[PDB]
């Protein structure tokens, strides 16, 4: 896994971001003391031994136990997905802006 | 549980329900595969080694084959029947007049006793048709495809009325040598398909069968298909979570394996439903490519149909539904007492075919331009086996041996299987001492 970790003023949650899009992820700063460090916001990030998780929900209406191989009783298939992984093994880097190289309380 | 529940609780196993012949007991037994096992698939017409090469016909050659059939048959009959000559069918003349032709329907489907129509060969009568009727006549039995001689009185030309219907003739059976077949008693069992109650996939009846097999040690058994019907509800909803050839392979492997114990021969009769095998007729022998090498000595396939030779005795091997079909069309004026079966047997005898019904039933596809050269009766045979959907029975008819074995599994319930004995004498007599010794229809 690799991308840039970005937050949003509209989902207020993790999102691994790339040109192709984004994904909801779940960092873990180890020993149940999680990340409060906001410098990692908007930076290149990488991880290897991860967990990819999917959640399945369905609107089933099966009548009995001998039609369990018979299609008539299933309508909605909602699918959630997200990444779960430790921060303690993070590979990190900032973005050197590729360019044409008192006040405040 | 629910598979074979209604089946496994049968109360009739081993029960001898009907049989015929000399006196023979219960504990039937044979020499397994001991030595003298005469076996061959004969034929001056070949026995269908390979496959066809046909998916398309050519019309006028059909006419050709119809013709050749009509001609050859008529000629061979007229030889014996010492009659002079027939008539171009449209020169009306009020005398006795003998005609040759084949019978057919005028209309779409079935018949009556008032719509038989006749058609003649290509040559003898210039090839045209004439309506008929037989009201004046007395006793007949007709059905499409059937070629026959007739006699009537042609008044108007485009009409006629019958006077008489001379009788068909069988050919003399194989009259074999007198040094080869001097053999002993012999047991053969046989059973058709399908192979379950039409809701499961268990082959429980196949288990019971192979049990009986291992029990009684037979010379050779032969098991008609169709080992997986298509009209079997479990299939035509596109259910089975598998390929098909695989299932064929499995439900063959089980048989060959369990059998290899009791050292007996097996031969297979394919039919028109084992969906992995294309549905044409006649049928090439099954395909198969994984033999326990030591058994290419024992088990051989055959084509559908075929004609097999054991100890110099003959067998007609059909995997059709013939008897039901011919039941579905025939007409006979006879109304006092008549075994419908006996008659249809007598017919199937003489026409040299396996399917003299023509036009064919709305499904039982065929293809003449090989059918005539691959599956015509090489000899009037001795024993004939024929599946059905009709109640089992057995008949000795005019030096011919026939048995309706019935099905194995009548829908969801028990069924039948056929068993018989063979031996030939070693002197003269009525010259056709039945090589069939005695026959038992033993219920499952």
């Amino acid at each position: 896994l690799l991308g840039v970790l970005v937050a949003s003023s509209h989902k207020g949650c993790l999102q691994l971001r790339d040109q192709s899009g984004s994904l909801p992820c779940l960092l873990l700063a180890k020993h149940s003391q999680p990340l409060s460090d906001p410098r990692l916001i908007g930076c290149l990030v990488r991880a290897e031994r991860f967990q990819l998780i999917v959640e399945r929900d369905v609107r089933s209406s099966f009548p009995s136990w001998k039609e369990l191989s018979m299609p008539g009783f299933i309508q909605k298939q909602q699918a959630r997905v997200y990444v779960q992984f430790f921060l303690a093994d993070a590979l990190i880097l900032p973005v050197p802006r590729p360019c044409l190289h008192h006040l405040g309380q | 549980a629910t598979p074979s529940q209604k089946y496994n609780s049968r109360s009739n196993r081993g029960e001898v329900v009907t049989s015929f012949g000399l006196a023979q007991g219960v504990s039937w037994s044979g020499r397994g595969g001991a030595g003298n096992i005469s076996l061959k698939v004969l034929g001056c017409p070949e026995a269908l080694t390979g496959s066809y090469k046909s998916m398309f016909q050519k019309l006028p050659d059909i006419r050709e084959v119809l013709t050749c059939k009509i001609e050859e048959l008529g000629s061979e009959l007229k030889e014996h029947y010492k009659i002079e000559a027939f008539t171009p069918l449209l020169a009306p003349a009020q005398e006795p007049v003998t005609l040759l032709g084949q019978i057919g329907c005028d209309s779409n489907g079935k018949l009556n006793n008032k719509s038989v129509i006749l058609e003649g060969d290509r040559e003898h009568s210039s090839g045209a048709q004439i309506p008929v009727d037989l009201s004046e006549l007395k006793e007949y039995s007709l059905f499409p495809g059937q070629v026959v001689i007739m006699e009537g009185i042609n008044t108007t030309g485009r009409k006629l009325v019958a006077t008489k219907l001379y009788e068909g003739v069988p050919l003399p059976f194989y009259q074999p040598t007198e040094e080869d077949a001097d053999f002993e008693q012999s047991m053969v069992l046989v059973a058709c398909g399908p192979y379950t109650t039409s809701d499961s996939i268990t082959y429980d009846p196949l288990l019971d069968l192979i049990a009986v097999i291992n029990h009684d040690r037979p010379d050779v058994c032969i098991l008609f298909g169709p080992f997986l019907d298509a009209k079997h509800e479990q299939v035509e909803n596109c259910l089975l979570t598998s390929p098909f050839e695989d299932i064929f392979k499995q439900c063959l492997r089980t048989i060959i394996e369990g059998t290899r114990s009791s050292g007996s021969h097996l031969v297979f009769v394919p039919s028109l439903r084992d969906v992995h095998h294309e549905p044409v007729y006649p049928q090439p022998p099954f395909s198969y490519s994984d033999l326990s090498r030591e058994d290419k000595k024992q088990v051989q396939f055959v084509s559908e149909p075929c004609s097999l030779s054991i100890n110099g005795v003959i067998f007609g091997l059909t995997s059709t539904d013939l008897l039901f079909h011919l039941g579905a069309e025939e007409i006979s004026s006879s109304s006092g007492t008549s075994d419908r079966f006996s008659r249809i047997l007598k017919h199937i005898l003489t026409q040299r075919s396996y399917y003299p019904l023509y036009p064919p039933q709305e499904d039982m596809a065929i293809d003449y331009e090989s059918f005539y050269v691959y599956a015509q009766l090489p000899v009037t045979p001795d024993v004939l086996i024929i599946p059905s959907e009709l109640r089992y029975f057995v008949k000795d008819v005019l030096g011919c041996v026939c048995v309706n074995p019935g099905r194995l599994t009548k829908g969801q319930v028990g069924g039948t299987f056929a068993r018989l004995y063979l031996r030939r004498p070693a002197a003269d007599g009525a010259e056709r001492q039945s090589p069939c010794i005695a026959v038992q229809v033993v219920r499952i």
């Binding site: 298939q77 | 998916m55 398309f56 016909q57 019309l59 779409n108 390929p243």
Partner: protein
């Protein structure tokens, strides 16, 4: 009377030297008017008399229920104290009753037509079987003015009618891909889970850069099962489908040609002529197969088409589209599954019918 006299004027039209344009014009306005004058119900029942003959007792016919007139004989001899027998005729008409039954039996003596209420004499049938076919016999092969056009002058009932084409004489004038197939039957498919149905026409599913493989996702927007993962099940239907097409052919119907007679049977008669054999009734006409082998082979090509994506993939022009889609989702697995089913099809036709031409008999 209506059909007979209509066609009689039709043929009478050609019998003068007006312009081909005048020919069309006159043979057009009259047609449209004739269609409408009943299409808006403005002609008496007297103008539809259907007198037909009789040969035997009504029950004699092996069509106990399968002629559009014998049913009335059944009626007349089973309902009243009035006899009808050999050598008699029936002056009836076909009449809809709003009952979605065959036209084979909604036949009626018109005296009840003028009596009851729900006896709606069917003014649909009387076009595709009385006016049109009569006009076809004669007016058809005129230049430009072709079959369906006549149809679309009276009643736009094309789809059903579209199947009739006189499609044996298109030789007087090598084919693009699709309309080598168009008139075949598509591949329909049952979904194993969502319950819906599908149709599999071309490998790619539609639009350009968006294009995706057929077997990927069930069509029904919501459900998310992916039918590919049921290759084997598809396999089944494939065979369990083809094993009825062949079923038809070797059982091939036989049908008539002279566009009036229209007989259907199988008992091949024995006389012969240039084109082949001759109907027994319309002794002045040929006979044709129904499922012309050309169909059968066409259809099997149509199957083998949409399972062999490899070809259509290779024929694709734009580099980047090809590379991107292949990068996307053409594993060895997906490919292999196509390969499997396509293989089943192709071998099952090339088994033995038609792709061969035995040169060893063609140059002797």
């Amino acid at each position: 009377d209506l059909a007979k006299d209509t066609g009689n004027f039709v043929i009478g039209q050609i019998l003068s030297d007006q312009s081909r344009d005048t020919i069309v014009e006159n043979i057009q306005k009259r047609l449209i008017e004739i269609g409408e004058n009943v299409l808006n119900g403005s002609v008496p029942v007297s103008q539809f008399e259907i007198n037909k003959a009789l040969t035997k007792d009504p029950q004699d016919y092996p069509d106990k229920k399968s002629l559009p007139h014998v049913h009335v004989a059944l009626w007349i001899n089973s309902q009243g104290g009035r006899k009808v027998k050999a050598g008699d005729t029936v002056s009836y008409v076909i009449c809809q009753d709003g009952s979605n039954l065959t036209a084979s039996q909604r036949a009626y003596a018109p005296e009840q037509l003028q009596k009851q209420d729900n006896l709606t004499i069917d003014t649909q049938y009387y076009l595709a079987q009385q006016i049109h076919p009569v006009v076809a016999r004669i007016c058809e092969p005129i230049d430009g003015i072709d079959a369906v056009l006549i149809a679309t002058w009276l009643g736009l009932d094309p789809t059903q009618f579209r199947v009739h084409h006189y499609h044996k004489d298109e030789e007087n004038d090598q084919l693009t891909d699709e309309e080598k197939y168009r008139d075949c039957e598509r591949f329909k498919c049952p979904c194993p889970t969502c319950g819906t149905e599908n149709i599999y026409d071309n490998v790619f599913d539609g639009s350009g850069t968006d294009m995706e493989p057929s077997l990927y996702r069930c069509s029904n927007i919501d459900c998310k099962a992916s039918p590919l993962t049921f290759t084997v099940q598809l396999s089944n239907k494939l065979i369990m489908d083809i094993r009825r097409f062949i079923k038809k052919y070797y059982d091939g119907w036989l049908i008539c040609e002279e566009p009036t007679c229209r007989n259907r049977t199988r008992h091949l008669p024995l006389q012969f002529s240039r084109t082949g054999p001759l109907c027994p009734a319309c002794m002045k006409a040929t006979l044709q197969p129904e499922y012309s082998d050309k169909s059968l082979y066409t259809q099997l090509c149509f199957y083998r088409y949409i399972f062999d994506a490899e070809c259509a993939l290779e024929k694709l022009t734009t580099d980047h589209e090809k590379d991107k889609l292949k990068k996307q989702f053409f594993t060895p697995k997906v490919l292999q599954d196509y390969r499997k089913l396509k293989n089943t099809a192709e071998q099952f036709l090339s088994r033995s019918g038609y792709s061969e031409v035995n040169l060893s008999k063609l140059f002797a």
